[PDB]
Structure 1
Amino acid sequence: HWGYGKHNGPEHWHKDFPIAKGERQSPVDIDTHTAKYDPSLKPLSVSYDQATSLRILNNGHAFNVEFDDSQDKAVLKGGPLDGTYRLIQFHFHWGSLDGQGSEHTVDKKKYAAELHLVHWNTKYGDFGKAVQQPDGLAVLGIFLKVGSAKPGLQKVVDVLDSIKTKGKSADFTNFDPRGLLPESLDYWTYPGSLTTPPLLECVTWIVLKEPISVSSEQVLKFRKLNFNGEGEPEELMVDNWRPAQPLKNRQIKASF
């Protein structure tokens, strides 16, 4: 099926998912000199104090940290958003080398990785209905650069050896996603899509300006994960990022 290689990677996705060539695809390059400050944006509210993580899953393309989204516990509101969006999962995209890995770019600059906190609009009742709506999802994107370790990431790094291969999961309760956030919530926002098949055009993207730093040893552990299943030959899970797609006359707004 779809993947990140020569034969099944982003250049091929349009065949099973024609929307890959659509009008609001993600990621995009953020041209900081074209983005305009928007005084009408309300402040962003990231409310993760009551977040309830359940499980971490290697899905053969990345790893998902899943949350209990059956009540308002971990929510995003404000900024460009109307109403309340509940956190369902987070995951990362990363490179084989520190010079690449993010999906969004900033004036063409690629970061070592990018974190996506995925949230659905509680007016649509659940995730599956939300992804049929142009305002169904809100993704909080955070860049990772290699430098100092991120302490709040280490519980994730240390569980990775237990989910090396496709289909493996592990209990992952009491993980606090507040430990993954940079200091500043300054952000760019634009309308876009999920960045993996089925590439649904349902996302208000909120991309924070300030990257988090993670250590070389932390990202190296991401690169030890496998795309393949247990029992299959080793295919390191690296370079699971889609490159920048055409902006097509969308406007990126700045909160700052």
Structure 2
Amino acid sequence: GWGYGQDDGPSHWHKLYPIAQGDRQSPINIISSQAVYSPSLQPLELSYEACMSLSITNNGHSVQVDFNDSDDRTVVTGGPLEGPYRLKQFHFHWGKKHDVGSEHTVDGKSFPSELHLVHWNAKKYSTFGEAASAPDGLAVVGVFLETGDEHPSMNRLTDALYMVRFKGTKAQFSCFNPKSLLPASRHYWTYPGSLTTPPLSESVTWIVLREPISISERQMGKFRSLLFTSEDDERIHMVNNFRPPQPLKGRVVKASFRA
């Protein structure tokens, strides 16, 4: 019952999921001058294996790559996290135009796209769903994307989009290392938040990396070729599939660096 259209978009989600107006909603506008430098935070480590990816799917809301999370081969640790969180999947948010698309913004600025690497506390909870209902259940690493030089590793992903252009379609996607989609810097902003799609559960520890990665305009354009609709229905391009900034509500945003 929810989407990114004019009748079912983010401004209307609260009608179905009241938590949409909660105190720990995401995304947010990150005001760099207001982030608190927290040196007490441990080093952020993204230990990813080369072949943990299972497939790529167009679920009607984004294009998602799912991982095998039976062990701790691909996990995030350090920074604000007390222990390791296993990678479940990653997906993206992008716009119809080149000046919008990201969910988080920095000092009012949006990027063309935003990548979310979704991890869960498999050590404490039995299922991803169970962890998604607990404050300390999930850890999402956000990476901003801008257009510039072509991204070599991104080609494998963008070349696979055609086969999953229609909603509900999926394809096998083996040996794709999400580490290849990370910037050289490990600086980040962290704050307690929520899923940015219904049920919008406030179970996410957000880790937004400071440095964006760049992909070519051609690559960005492939994402816009995806569709919100299925093969039969009329064609509606999957664009502007992002939730805009939500009220900070007195939350504290920490930074691993000094602006």
For Structure 1 versus Structure 2, the TM-score category normalised by the shorter chain is over 0.9
1:53-80: per-residue Cα shift (whole Å, max 9, x none)?
A: 0011100010110000011110001000
Aligned to 1:110: 110
Shift of 1:152: 1.4
Superposition pairs for residues 108-147 of structure 1, below 5 Å?
108-122=108-122, 123-147=124-148
Contact 1:51–1:177 under 8 Å retained in 2: no
| Match status 1:20 vs 2:20 | yes
Shift of 1:50: 5.0
Higher alpha-carbon deviation: 235-244 or 148-157: 148-157
- Displacement over 2 Å in runs of 4+: none
Percent same amino acid at aligned positions? 57
| Unmatched runs of 5 consecutive residues or more in structure 1 | none
- The separation in 2 between residues aligned to 1:88 and 1:167, in whole angstroms, is 19
1:102-129: per-residue Cα shift (whole Å, max 9, x none)?
A: 0000000000000000000122132011
- 3-state DSSP of counterpart to 1:128: helix
1:136-185: per-residue Cα shift (whole Å, max 9, x none)?
A: 00000000001011111111100000001110000011111111000001
Q: TM-score, normalised by structure 2?
A: 0.98
CA RMSD of the aligned region, Å?
0.7
| Match status 1:249 vs 2:230 | no
Q: TM-score, normalised by structure 1?
A: 0.99
Contact 1:188–1:255 under 8 Å retained in 2: yes
The count of corresponding residues between Structure 1 and Structure 2 is 256
Aligned to 2:208: 207
- The separation in 2 between residues aligned to 1:164 and 1:176, in whole angstroms, is 22
Aligned to 1:92: 92
Contact 2:67–2:89 under 8 Å retained in 1: yes
Contact 2:116–2:143 under 8 Å retained in 1: yes
One-letter code aligned to 2:35: A
- The separation in 2 between residues aligned to 1:195 and 1:87, in whole angstroms, is 17
Superposition pairs for residues 218-229 of structure 1, below 5 Å?
218-229=219-230
- The separation in 2 between residues aligned to 1:186 and 1:46, in whole angstroms, is 12
| Match status 1:57 vs 2:54 | no
Contact 2:50–2:175 under 8 Å retained in 1: no
Shift of 1:51: 4.7
1:4-37: per-residue Cα shift (whole Å, max 9, x none)?
A: 0110000110011000000000000000000010
- The separation in 2 between residues aligned to 1:51 and 1:15, in whole angstroms, is 41
Contact 2:51–2:174 under 8 Å retained in 1: no
